[PDB]
């Protein structure tokens, strides 16, 4: 029947004080016949009331999607407070409860290393720059790329991989035109993680 997802906020949103992090409670496969969904929210078992209620939207088989988004406070999430969405619908035997919070455990800061293009990489029209990150906990992290205070969006980052010591690692590849690299422009991978000083660090690389 009706199925519930509770998504945590984007790591960038929780680590940047200028952004507003939010938990999202998504209910799918809500029948046309019993479409009303009632959301209850709880922060550490204590009910709160500021949640926003989006209007329903058509889905496949005479079903609706209904969503409810709750703004969280950076420090609440970071302090490990537990967020609960309670979903009630007439077609439900009992209400459905989902629980999300930041992983518990000693925060470990990421170690970042950069890899310039190989000799072969330099023969192509487009070169790739790589950023290796390890040693971090929890797995919540944001990796983005910039050059000259402008975003560089042509990158791909792997999901964090669990390490045998309990921490996490990943890599990120940015592809840029070779002419831009040849010109001498500096490129940076920016890493945001809870355990970094001010949640932010940056490694750079340019043509030698």
């Amino acid at each position: 029947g009706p199925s519930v997802f509770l998504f945590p906020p984007k790591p960038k949103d929780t680590l940047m004080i200028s952004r507003t992090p939010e938990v999202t409670c998504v209910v799918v496969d809500v029948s046309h016949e019993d479409p009303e969904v009632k959301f209850n929210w709880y922060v550490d078992g204590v009910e709160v009331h500021n949640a926003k209620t989006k209007p329903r939207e058509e889905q496949y088989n005479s079903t609706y999607r209904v969503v409810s988004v709750l703004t969280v406070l950076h420090q609440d999430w970071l302090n490990g407070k537990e967020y609960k969405c309670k979903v009630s619908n007439k077609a439900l035997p009992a209400p459905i409860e989902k629980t999300i919070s930041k992983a518990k455990g000693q925060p470990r800061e990421p170690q970042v290393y950069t890899l310039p293009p190989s000799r072969e990489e330099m023969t192509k029209n487009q070169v790739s720059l790589t950023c290796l990150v390890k040693g971090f906990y929890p797995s919540d992290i944001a990796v983005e790329w910039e050059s000259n205070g402008q975003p560089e969006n042509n990158y791909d980052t792997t999901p964090p991989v669990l390490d045998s010591d309990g921490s996490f690692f990943l890599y990120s590849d940015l592809t840029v035109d070779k002419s831009r690299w040849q010109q001498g422009n500096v490129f940076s991978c920016s890493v945001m993680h809870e355990a970094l000083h001010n949640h932010y660090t940056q490694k750079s690389l340019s043509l030698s």
Binding site: L15, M16, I17, Q150, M192, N198, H199
Partner: peptide, 13 residues
């Protein structure tokens, strides 16, 4: 001191 990402405020200490 404060960290900034692409002209946007990250965090202060």
């Amino acid at each position: 001191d404060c960290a900034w990402h692409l002209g946007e405020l990250v965090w202060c200490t």
